[PDB]
Swiss-Prot record, chains A, B:
Protein's name in the database: Mucosa-associated lymphoid tissue lymphoma translocation protein 1
The organism's place on the tree of life at top rank: Eukaryota
Subunit structure: Homooligomer; forms oligomers which bind to TRAF6. Forms a complex with CARD14 and MALT1; resulting in the formation of a CBM (CARD14-BCL10-MALT1) complex. Forms a complex with CARD11 and MALT1; resulting in the formation of a CBM (CARD11-BCL10-MALT1) complex. Forms a complex with CARD9 and MALT1; resulting in the formation of a CBM (CARD9-BCL10-MALT1) complex.
Domain Death residue range list: 12-97
Family to which the UniProt record says this protein belongs: Belongs to the peptidase C14B family.
Disease (UniProt): Immunodeficiency 12: A primary immunodeficiency characterized by onset in infancy of recurrent bacterial and candidal infections resulting in bronchiectasis and growth delay. Manifestations include mastoiditis, aphthous ulcers, cheilitis, gingivitis, esophagitis, gastritis, duodenitis, and meningitis. Levels of absolute lymphocytes and serum immunoglobulins are normal, but specific antibody titers are low despite immunization, and T-cells show impaired proliferative responses to mitogens. A chromosomal aberration involving MALT1 is recurrent in low-grade mucosa-associated lymphoid tissue (MALT lymphoma). Translocation t(11;18)(q21;q21) with BIRC2. This translocation is found in approximately 50% of cytogenetically abnormal low-grade MALT lymphoma.
Subcellular location(s) per record: Cytoplasm, Perinuclear region; Nucleus
Tissue note: Highly expressed in peripheral blood mononuclear cells. Detected at lower levels in bone marrow, thymus and lymph node, and at very low levels in colon and lung.
Function: Protease that enhances BCL10-induced activation: acts via formation of CBM complexes that channel adaptive and innate immune signaling downstream of CARD domain-containing proteins (CARD9, CARD11 and CARD14) to activate NF-kappa-B and MAP kinase p38 pathways which stimulate expression of genes encoding pro-inflammatory cytokines and chemokines. Mediates BCL10 cleavage: MALT1-dependent BCL10 cleavage plays an important role in T-cell antigen receptor-induced integrin adhesion. Involved in the induction of T helper 17 cells (Th17) differentiation.
Amino acid sequence: ATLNRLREPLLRRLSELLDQAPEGRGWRRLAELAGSRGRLRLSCLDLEQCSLKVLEPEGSPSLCLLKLMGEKGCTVTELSDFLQAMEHTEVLQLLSP
Amino acid sequence: ATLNRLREPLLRRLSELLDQAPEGRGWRRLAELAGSRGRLRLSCLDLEQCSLKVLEPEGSPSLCLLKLMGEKGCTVTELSDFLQAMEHTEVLQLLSP
């Protein structure tokens, strides 16, 4: 099933963890990677709408992003693939001149 | 000279006109084109900072964008090249299936 259809506690938890992740592997980098590596396409405007969530008392840009990716077809295993690609590309970029 | 060093009345006027342009040839499309066609690179975060300008009483996202492009080296003639490329690509996309 797609991320936006995940049980709502689990999706909450995913979004909290991604919200706490460092800049190099945060929701913006996740959007960057999913918007270039798959047929899933995000514009700057979508990212903006998610970014504004932080203005709500306990708002989550990662919750917005994950739901949007799910609506665009992303599944849990696809998200996991994306996150480990994030890890690999981060360390490869650190080691690159 | 660069856009951010233009006389400040002229830069005002450029930004007002771009702010009034339609969606197909607006400041977001200008950023899109300049961020892919030249070595000038804008992130979604820069565009976000410009987008937030509209929250100021008479604020201008195009003013922010044009200054940022100038700081990154864009000249007046380069901006004109970008704007006419905007026109051409818009009409080519309308005529494309």
